[PDB]
Design a protein around this nucleic acid. Structure first.
Ligand SMILES: Cc1cn([C@H]2C[C@H](O)[C@@H](COP(=O)(O)OP(=O)(O)OP(=O)(O)O)O2)c(=O)[nH]c1=O
Ligand SMILES: [Ca+2]
Ligand SMILES: [Ca+2]
Ligand SMILES: [Ca+2]
Ligand SMILES: [Ca+2]
Ligand SMILES: [Ca+2]
Length: 895
DNA sequence: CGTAATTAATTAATTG
DNA sequence: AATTAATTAATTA
């Protein structure tokens, strides 16, 4: 097998590399890498190195990395461009791995761990690490074992050994319910004192040094805590042994009185799973406790205990250790499902960056582009300083607020990267400019044809057609990868719905789930077999389909983010190929494409239909159009339909056979009009939406831009077994909306679109009757807590203090002089509740850290002073008022 | 050190 | 309540 790197670092004039060799064995080497950079040279100098603009460059080979770096500084001061990859580890990696990397994950040491620290005086700050580490569980991917380091004796208590027997038993049975599938994988090690525990953990770490270090919050708690505790007890050089090169860097953050740190461990790539989850999951969560995320992703129960966590070891060491192990295993479970580590390795190795650089689209693209250009013996430009400037983006149509009964939407395939490729937008493909007519004139095809020679964008930019830009070239490759995974995801999704259909009529038999790969559409033979399966076999198959869909979702949506990020990167001053003309070309072409196709669809739909000048396109946003289908249904006649699936079939056929071909012809004209390099504006039907046939449901509605709801029966080829609500922007979608309110408003929308006005009125009353009985957490608002210090005036709200900060300031006054009540962390999320006037908290609202029961000392008071009336009006009634007024409905029977 | 467009909620001040 | 502006948070794309 071909070699691949694990980690790369620059220490002085040396590159330190851990790698897998041709026999699949982990190795380390130190290389005195001699880098190269380039300067522009007179034409009269024969060479093989040119910049992206085809200007001649001469290579300077340096004795070592410091002198290359020194050369750059020198070139800045003179004002002469120093060209080349100035990040030397990428340059090194590009030389040492002169090929598409094929990697083997089973050889990569992936490690997650977490630690427990008992603290009788509040949060144990990693920067002081003054309390003993009393448990560590460290899972090693290569061994596939959980190494459990348990402290038996501590200042805060001497405890008995942990029983794997009791651990294994379910909680019903008085056990700890450690999943049976990992029981046999636990290697348990108790210790007499903290010193040998830590010493043994160090040697262990030396034997089994992580390449990928992960876990939950490990970068901000576990890593810095372990590092500092070992430092205090043993000394810094001993703590440096966590780096396989005995080098670390401590980053210090703020913070008036507060101080937290982040350790960089040279020779390891840290991918904190919270950070992976925030970047790659495409959710926004009310809370980021592992308990909250585990429940969300895996549907597992919260890790319940009695007393505060600072007394859990003391009172129930057994559960203390079991919960430590499970916590570690839950992250593993989440990744088994989400597959983010895998995604990181894929992207990292494709780009030839340090794996931890996947968090950075700019860094990622810089390497991809560098490698792509290096292969052709071309030289990359030097990074330049730019001022930050606002620039124009997408077009959003103003909709008429209303109910819309039948709606078909259409959306463009991967729009921005498609524009990049169609127009040939790249730093080196710029050809010139033309005189700019109003966008409106290009939309209406009345403006003069910009160029007969070059590929054009309505912002005035012209690009060469006769060669390919590095940006179109490299975005195309990732796009194709994205396309493949999306294919796998949609088939998995379609397969899911087939299984869902089959669950309506489950057969009474004893059978097994079928052995199938879900990334592929079921064969007819398979579909026949599915119709004779039992619910048990069907339900298990469904779970597997859904799991396959999720993996395909991860793979496709993150590749989409990467490619869409290149379009954005053109507008970030830190990107080497930053150019606002190129960013503008993309967005302005986009604005044209959408409005252009709006005109074309209306024109078409007026011809068929036999109408004159009706606006069929009700709404659009960036790359999408929403088409009122009422008149399409009208022509054939609503009474002509047997059931819902009949008119859904009808519209589906009409879009596929009539609309898409008319749209394609429309965009081919535009491409010719802009003289583009390649036609790639592909717009296909997305949603078919409407009320169930024969019902009083309204089907859908808009309140304004970026705010609507649709009852969808078919989504880009997936025919649902049950209609799904497509709700965008509305409070049902916002993480700041109370949990119970999100559900109530969703059922409200469901009744409106599927059942009608009378049904809505029934639910409203029922919810209102039950509101005061719901759990206070489920009805609390949520918000991020930024700038708490800015508005804190002696514990009281300063000028312009936001409601949610006011709440935090009310919290902080309530918990003064109290050690074991949890503190609100700057930047984190908080639950928020209104308080009735005359409350003893002295203010109108209170806030406490999200994902946690409010501390017992004031829970009783908060529950009693909650303003349910304000709460209901603010979070539930006001949003519904907006939905219903837009849809011309009443939530209460009007007098 | 991917982007812009857009909403809703809330504070301050003003609307004779 | 009802604006206009400014800030903050959170979406859609
Ligand atoms: C989601 C997203 C979209 N956009 C812009 C660029 C997209 O091409 C355009 C349309 O967004 P989308 O339609 O959401 O995505 P897409 O067209 O790029 O990909 P798909 O094939 O699944 O439809 O909006 C961003 O700039 N950043 C983003 O994060
Ligand atoms: Ca814990
Ligand atoms: Ca799209
Ligand atoms: Ca059946
Ligand atoms: Ca879209
Ligand atoms: Ca599509």
């Amino acid at each position: 097998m071909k070699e691949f790197y694990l980690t790369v670092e620059q220490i002085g004039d040396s590159i330190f590399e851990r790698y897998i060799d041709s026999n699949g064995r982990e190795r380390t080497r130190e290389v005195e890498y001699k880098p190269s950079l380039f300067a522009h040279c007179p034409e009269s100098q024969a060479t093989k190195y040119f910049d992206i603009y085809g200007k001649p460059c001469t290579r300077k080979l340096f004795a070592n990395m410091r002198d290359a770096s020194q050369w750059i500084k020198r070139m800045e001061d003179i004002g002469l461009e120093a060209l080349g990859m100035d990040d030397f580890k990428l340059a090194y990696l590009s030389d040492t791995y002169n090929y598409e990397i094929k990697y083997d994950h089973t050889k990569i040491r992936v490690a997650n761990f977490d630690i427990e620290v008992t603290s009788p005086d509040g949060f144990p700050e990693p920067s002081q690490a003054k309390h003993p580490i009393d448990a560590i569980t460290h899972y090693d991917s290569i061994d596939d074992r959980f190494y459990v380091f348990d402290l038996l004796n501590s200042p805060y208590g001497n405890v008995e050994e942990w029983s794997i027997e009791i651990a294994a038993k379910l909680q019903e049975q008085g056990g700890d319910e450690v999943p049976s599938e990992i029981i046999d994988k636990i290697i348990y090690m108790p210790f007499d004192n903290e010193k040998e525990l830590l010493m043994e953990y160090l040697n262990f770490w030396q034997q089994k040094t992580p390449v990928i270090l992960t876990g939950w919050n490990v970068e901000s708690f576990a890593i810095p805590y372990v590092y500092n505790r070992i430092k205090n007890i043993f000394g810094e050089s001993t703590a440096k042994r966590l780096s396989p090169h005995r080098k670390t860097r401590v980053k210090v953050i703020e913070n008036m009185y507060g101080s937290r740190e982040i350790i960089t461990l040279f020779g390891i790539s840290v991918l904190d799973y919270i950070d992976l989850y925030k970047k790659f999951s495409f959710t926004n969560q009310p809370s980021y406790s592992l308990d909250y995320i585990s429940e969300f992703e895996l549907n597992v129960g919260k890790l319940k205990y009695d007393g505060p966590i600072s007394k859990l070891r003391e009172s129930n060491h057994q559960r203390y250790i079991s919960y430590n192990i499970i916590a570690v295993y839950r992250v593993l479970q989440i990744d088994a499902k989400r597959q983010f580590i895998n995604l990181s390795l894929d992207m990292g190795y494709y780009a030839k960056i340090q794996i931890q650089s996947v968090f950075s689209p700019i860094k990622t693209w810089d390497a991809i582009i560098f490698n792509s250009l290096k292969e052709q013996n071309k030289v990359i430009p030097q990074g330049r300083s730019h001022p930050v400037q606002p620039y124009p983006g997408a077009f959003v149509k103003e909709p008429i607020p209303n109910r819309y009964k039948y709606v078909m939407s259409f959306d463009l395939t991967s729009l921005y990267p498609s524009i990049i490729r169609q127009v040939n937008i790249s730093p080196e493909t710029i050809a010139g400019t033309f005189k700019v007519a109003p966008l409106h004139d290009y939309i209406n095809a009345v403006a003069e044809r910009p160029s007969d020679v070059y590929s054009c964008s309505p912002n005035g930019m012209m690009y060469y057609k006769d060669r390919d830009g590095v940006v179109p070239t490299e975005i195309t490759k990732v796009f194709n990868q994205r396309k493949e995974h999306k294919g796998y995801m949609l088939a998995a999704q379609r397969n899911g719905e087939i299984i869902k259909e089959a669950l309506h009529n489950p057969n009474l038999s004893v059978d097994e789930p079928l052995d199938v790969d879900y990334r592929f559409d079921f064969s007819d033979e398979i579909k026949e077999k599915i119709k004779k399966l039992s619910a048990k076999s069907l339900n298990e198959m469904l779970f597997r389909a859904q799991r396959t869909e999720v993996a395909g979702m991860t793979a496709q949506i993150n590749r989409k983010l990467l490619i869409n990020s290149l379009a954005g990167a053109l507008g970030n001053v830190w990107f080497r190929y930053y150019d606002l003309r190129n960013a503008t070309a993309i967005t302005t072409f986009g604005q044209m494409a959408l409005q252009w196709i709006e005109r074309k669809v209306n024109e078409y739909l007026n011809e068929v239909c036999g109408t004159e000048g009706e606006a069929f396109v009700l709404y659009g946003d960036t790359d999408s159009i929403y088409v009122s289908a009422d008149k399409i249904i009208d022509k054939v006649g609503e009474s002509k339909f047997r059931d819902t699936n009949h008119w859904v079939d009808f519209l589906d056929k009409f879009a596929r056979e009539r609309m898409e071909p008319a749209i394609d012809r429309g965009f081919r004209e535009m491409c010719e009009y802009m003289n583009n390099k390649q036609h790639l504006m592909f717009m296909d039907r997305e949603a078919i939406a409407g009320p169930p046939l024969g019902s009083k449901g309204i089907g859908g509605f808009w309140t304004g831009k970026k705010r609507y709801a649709l009852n969808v029966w078919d989504m880009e080829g997936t025919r649902y077994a049950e209609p799904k609500l497509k709700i965008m922007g509305l409070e049902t979608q916002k993480s700041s909306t109370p949990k119970a309110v999100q559900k109530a408003l969703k059922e409200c929308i469901r009744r409106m679109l599927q059942e009608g006005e009378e049904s809505l009125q029934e639910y409203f009353k029922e919810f209102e009757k039950e509101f005061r009985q719901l759990n206070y957490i489920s009805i609390a608002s949520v918000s991020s807590a930024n700038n708490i210090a800015k508005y804190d005036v002696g514990g009281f709200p300063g000028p312009k203090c936001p409601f949610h900060i006011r709440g935090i300031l009310t919290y902080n006054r309530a918990i003064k002089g109290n050690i074991d009540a949890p503190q609100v962390v700057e930047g984190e999320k908080v639950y928020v509740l209104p308080l009735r006037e005359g409350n003893p908290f002295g203010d109108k609202c209170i806030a406490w850290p999200s994902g946690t029961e409010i501390t017992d000392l004031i829970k009783d008071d908060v529950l009693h002073w909650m303003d349910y009336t304000v709460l209901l009006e603010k979070t539930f009634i006001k949003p519904l008022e907006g939905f219903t007024s837009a849809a011309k409905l009443d939530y209460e029977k009007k007098a």
